[PDB]
Amino acid sequence: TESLDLEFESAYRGVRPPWSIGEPQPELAALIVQGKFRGDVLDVGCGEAAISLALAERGHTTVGLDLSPAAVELARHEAAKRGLANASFEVADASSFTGYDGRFDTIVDSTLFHSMPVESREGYLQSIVRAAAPGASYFVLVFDRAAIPEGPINAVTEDELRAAVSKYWIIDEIKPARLYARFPAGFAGMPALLDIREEPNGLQSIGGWLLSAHLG
Ligand SMILES: Nc1ncnc2c1ncn2[C@@H]1O[C@H](CSCC[C@H](N)C(=O)O)[C@@H](O)[C@H]1O
Ligand code: NA
Ligand code: NA
């Protein structure tokens, strides 16, 4: 068995989590501007939910689900600052949740995928399909196993991601992507044990995959 529950809750309680960049992940924002996000949106493993909030400002009704109660507090607090009525959040387990049958037209996984055990993937994919309206779109941003080793994080190879997701969705594209964060100084050692790319605006990125799919 393996579990990151205590770590995520401690990170959100707080120094802020490196992945809480205060904006949607750039790779996913690019899909939004292309018009790929439609209708009611589910932000699964939402964390502080920057992408939910950006979508709710654009007129979408959004729901964010996270196993961490501290994440859900932060998401609600930023929704209050922005005066949003159309963004809601709930504490739930993405691998086994109900109550939203056929509700969502777009489901977005912004780095949740690698944050659960490999054995939970089936239940997660079944749960989001159950919550999906006909023809829904699904987008995943996930670490690449070439960048993040076997350990607490269950990063994926392209073939592994395709095999897991294609059992439940029609895959349109899988391509290399960057996952952005603001890591502390000396993150992962000196020398560093991971390949961390330095980006503009003091951000960093790690290699990943961006998958686009739709319910068949
Ligand atoms: N089984 C599960 N169900 C729901 N959320 C989960 C989960 N396992 C992990 N999480 C959540 O997955 C998130 C991964 S970090 C990414 C958070 C956010 N989507 C962002 O892009 O900033 C964390 O908020 C963590 O608490
Ligand atoms: Na988890
Ligand atoms: Na690219």
From Swiss-Prot:
It catalyses: 2-heptyl-1-hydroxy-4(1H)-quinolinone + S-adenosyl-L-methionine = 2-heptyl-1-methoxy-4(1H)-quinolinone + S-adenosyl-L-homocysteine + H(+); 3-bromo-2-heptyl-1-hydroxy-4(1H)-quinolinone + S-adenosyl-L-methionine = 3-bromo-2-heptyl-1-methoxy-4(1H)-quinolinone + S-adenosyl-L-homocysteine + H(+); 3-methyl-1-oxo-2-[3-oxo-3-(pyrrolidin-1-yl)propyl]-1,5-dihydrobenzo[4,5]imidazo[1,2-a]pyridine-4-carbonitrile + S-adenosyl-L-methionine = 3,5-dimethyl-1-oxo-2-[3-oxo-3-(pyrrolidin-1-yl)propyl]-1,5-dihydrobenzo[4,5]imidazo[1,2-a]pyridine-4-carbonitrile + S-adenosyl-L-homocysteine + H(+). It is found in: Cytoplasm. Disruption phenotype: Deletion of the gene has no effect on growth in medium containing salicylate or on intra-macrophage replication. Deletion does not affect sensitivity to plumbagin, menadione, nigericin, PAS or CCCP. Is dispensable under in vitro conditions in both axenic and macrophage culture. Induction: Repressed by the transcriptional repressor Rv2887. Induced by salicylate, during iron deprivation (at RNA level), by anaerobiosis and by superoxide generating naphthoquinones such as menadione and plumbagin and by pro-oxidant phenoxyisobutyrates (fibrates) such as gemfibrozil (at protein level). Part of the Rv0560c-Rv0559c operon. Operon induction is slow but is maintained for at least 2 weeks in aerobic culture in the presence of salicylate. Coiled coil: none annotated. One of its GO terms (cellular component) is cytosol. Its main location: cytoplasm. This is 2-heptyl-1-hydroxyquinolin-4(1H)-one methyltransferase. Keywords: Cytoplasm, Methyltransferase, S-adenosyl-L-methionine, Transferase. Involved in cellular response to chemical stress and may contribute to resistance toward antimicrobial natural compounds as well as drugs. Catalyzes the methylation and detoxification of the P.aeruginosa toxin 2-heptyl-1-hydroxy-4(1H)-quinolinone (HQNO) to 2-heptyl-1-methoxy-4(1H)-quinolinone (HMOQ). Can also methylate 3-bromo-2-heptyl-1-hydroxy-4(1H)-quinolinone, and shows much lower activity with 1-hydroxyquinolin-4(1H)-one, quercetin, 4-hydroxyquinolin-2(1H)-one (DHQ) and 4-hydroxyisoquinolin-1(2H)-one. One of its GO terms (molecular function) is methyltransferase activity. The gene is htm. Belongs to the methyltransferase superfamily. It comes from Mycobacterium tuberculosis (strain ATCC 25618 / H37Rv). Monomer. One of its GO terms (biological process) is response to salicylic acid. Its EC number is 2.1.1.374.
